[model samples]
Target: SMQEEDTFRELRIFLRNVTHRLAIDKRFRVFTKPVDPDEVPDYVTVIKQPMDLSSVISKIDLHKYLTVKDYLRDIDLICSNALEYNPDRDPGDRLIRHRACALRDTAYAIIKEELDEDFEQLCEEIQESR
Candidate 1:
């Protein structure tokens, strides 16, 4: 009985760490975090970046980056966006797996709807900061 309990406890621990690993990765959903070169898929064409602001700024796709920022501020933005996009979308797709493209598309559409001067000024400020 003690041996069985020990194995069960270990299985729980292992599963916990597994989820934690995915959580602690660059993201569980949004794509704001830069890909660690080590994890880039072989299918991807790597654009090398030096460890500097220039690389980060240059690599950033401005609109997509902003969406990620907003998503950070509003988690529901991603879920609601995903749900509205396709309710049948997989639970796993709600975030990272299918999340990036979904958020980007939703964000671009929001751009046309939300082009007030305040948002324009905000965009200018974001541009200047870079």
Candidate 2:
């Protein structure tokens, strides 16, 4: 039962991490001027693809037990991913910004809820373990 609980905990953390990263990555794609081929016939084309949290979740360690510290670690991972994937320059793309905002909000909600629950559970577990 402990293993099962830990597995679920890891899954939750993984989901939270992926969602957060995806939101940050999506921001890069938002707000960009339409490409004008005539201006620079061969300008480097950068296509922004939205990140899929589900895909990332599928790749992580699911069976291993995850402690409350592991969940906290994920928050850092999410922030790092966002910073790492952030666009060098603003896209100036309104549509993309809107989409990114929506994604960010969704991820924020998930993270907030999980963090609250994890903190509460972790405190209880620590007391019980003691």
Candidate 3:
């Protein structure tokens, strides 16, 4: 039980630090906070579920996510929503789509760096440390 609790706290700290890195990236400024419907009234109509970096951080602080994969999905969801809302259509905006692509790439790049080794290896390291 002692080991299990420490491991959990380690994982939480790891996730919290990684997410803060993502939030501070200049490319992700727009994604750092929740999307306001007042700014884009139709944004809600198009996106049923909205996710953001700030929201992920909040969830982590609240212990809403039990594992790293859970928050990883949220980061993906935020990027995915951006891509979906700005698809290449008759009247498309490559600006947003391209921006989303950059965000996604940067997010994953930072994540991959932290999780470079095999997942099992990473977990073992975390579990073994403090």
For each candidate in the order shown, give its overall lDDT on alpha carbons: 0.39, 0.47, 0.75
State how far residue 52 of model 1 sits from its true place (Å). 15
lDDT score of model 2? 0.47
Candidate with best TM-score? 3
Which prediction has the highest lDDT against the true structure?
3
> Cα lDDT of model 1 overall?
0.39
Candidate 1 wrongly placed segments (more than 4 Å): 1-30, 41-97, 116-130
Name the weakest run of 10 consecutive residues (lDDT summed) in model 3. Answer: 115-124
Instruction: Give me the displacement of residue 40 in model 3, in angstroms.
Output: 0.3
Error of 3 at 63 (Å): 1.4
lDDT string for model 2 (68-130, tens) is 444434434433434344445566434444454555565556656655675546645744564
* Candidate 2 deviant stretches above 4 angstroms: 1-10, 13-51, 61-92, 114-130
lDDT, candidate 3, 1-130, per-residue tens: 6766665677678788888877787767888887788998878999999988888888888877655567678878988898887777644457767667887777677667775445535555554563
Give the Å error, residue 126, model 1: 18
Report the lDDT of model 3 for residue 48: 91
